[PDB]
Design an enzyme around this catalytic site. Sequence first.
Site, PDB file in Angstrom:
ATOM      1  CG  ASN A 186      32.488 -24.571   0.608  1.00  0.00           C
ATOM      2  OD1 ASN A 186      33.372 -24.086  -0.252  1.00  0.00           O
ATOM      3  ND2 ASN A 186      32.056 -24.375   1.676  1.00  0.00           N
ATOM      4  CG  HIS A 188      30.238 -27.306  -4.706  1.00  0.00           C
ATOM      5  ND1 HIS A 188      29.055 -27.800  -5.118  1.00  0.00           N
ATOM      6  CD2 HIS A 188      30.517 -26.212  -4.270  1.00  0.00           C
ATOM      7  CE1 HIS A 188      28.113 -26.732  -4.585  1.00  0.00           C
ATOM      8  NE2 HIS A 188      28.883 -25.680  -4.339  1.00  0.00           N
ATOM      9  CB  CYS A 223      29.580 -34.060 -11.440  1.00  0.00           C
ATOM     10  SG  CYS A 223      29.052 -35.699 -10.940  1.00  0.00           S
TER      11      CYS A 223
END
Lengths: 265, 262
Positions: A186, A188, A223
């Site tokens: 995804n 991330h 982050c």
Amino acid sequence: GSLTEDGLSYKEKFVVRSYEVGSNKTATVETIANLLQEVGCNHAQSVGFSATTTTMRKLHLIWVTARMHIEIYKYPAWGDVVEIETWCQSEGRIGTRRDWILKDSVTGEVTGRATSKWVMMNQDTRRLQKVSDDVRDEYLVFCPQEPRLAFPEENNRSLKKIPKLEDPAQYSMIGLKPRRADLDMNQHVNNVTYIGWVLESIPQEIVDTHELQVITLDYRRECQQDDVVDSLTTTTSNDSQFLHLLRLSGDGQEINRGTTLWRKK
Amino acid sequence: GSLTEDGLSYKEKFVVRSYEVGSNKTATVETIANLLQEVGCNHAQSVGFTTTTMRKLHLIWVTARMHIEIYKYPAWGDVVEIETWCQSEGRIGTRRDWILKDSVTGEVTGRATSKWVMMNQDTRRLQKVSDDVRDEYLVFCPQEPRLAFPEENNRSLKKIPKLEDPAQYSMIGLKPRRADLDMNQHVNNVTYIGWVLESIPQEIVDTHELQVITLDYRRECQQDDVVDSLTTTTSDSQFLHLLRLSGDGQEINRGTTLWRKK
Ligand SMILES: Nc1ccc(F)cc1C(=O)O
Ligand SMILES: Nc1ccc(F)cc1C(=O)O
């Protein structure tokens, strides 16, 4: 892997790979952390999830890691078979907990254990919220009814409050950026990358003379793909203990805080 | 895994893991490259392994070139079977080839070849093989040629040119972390594939899938070194690649990639 007889936990075996081992010829804590996540994903899949429920997908709600606590007694060697058992448990409206037990396949001994606290959040707005009754009832059938804790002790390290590191840090590693191998499907950043980023500021001497026993990590903010991180470490202590802080290079915004405990080889 | 009936190759099955897949929900080329290395190590261990003569003379096998071609990346949960084998190329060095298959259909979903050279572990000097050491690993290799890329004049043997400045795309300040090191503290050869692909623009990742990657290894990146990844379009889309040290601009790798429209 497979769900156990009662269907309230999941077991899986892994053969440690050559690229998974570090300087001690045994699996790294990042490799272990990846295996904990992999068995978690196989448990969720084996009980119908894709770990969002029917009601969570409708409201755009996701499970997010708030805390991870890993304790390793013996890291498995290259070629060794390690068996991991995982299970979920509701913590009322605060969120859910996933616990793991790591065993040596031949001796049957517990070589490590882990616990993680998860919270509910809106996927789009990033707003944390308490668990509703309709959601709680959907996953309670897959969790043991009586408490089953990986860290049962009355004063366990897994629930301790982590303080904020004060400048100046004793050690630091600057300009850490994630590459595409650090991202999940995804896009991330993988939660395991932050464990690696925390350990980047441990001095070479500690790596040479000590072995990592415990790592507790708080997740405050994620982050992004185009963000830059600074990893800070200060000694707080035979055993050595450390305080950790990950923050954005620019503004100094906190993304993670943690502690590690190292034992003499 | 296990050696095949004739003992001249090694086969192993792998279940693709959730953290091993990328943006397309299929295993990344870095994950595949790690699996190729893992089956190579299990083949070396299953036949007694560096040989005994190499150990006393302080000699090691070093990768000079890697060539991977993927037709279909396996999905999360899929079983992939890899067969690997070694072969002597006379005094130039050795070759390791791999064939990737889908376990259910039995179809070839990918193939790879790698050229290895002899080097002194301490002085980092090439020096060709010997003859005495060949009478130690020729018994583990098929006698007749067995090529993963047999075709006369194929992509795996093409000369890679040096990228001229200015590059079209670049990714600068790439540093290895401790997870990028192997048991002997050397940067993993797979990290350089990741570093090469760091300068491919996001648009290509969105519209195209990687089919071929050829990589030349010139020099090793140390634990305290910093790398710049350069890429220029040479065309399906094709690219020219260069990895160099941030400071002096010393070359560590050169390569090419070929991307197919999704
Ligand atoms: N892989 C690692 C990551 C962090 C660390 F502090 C040590 C190692 C190691 O190889 O022992
Ligand atoms: N993991 C990756 C590394 C490099 C790249 F260019 C693309 C991907 C991907 O996820 O498709």
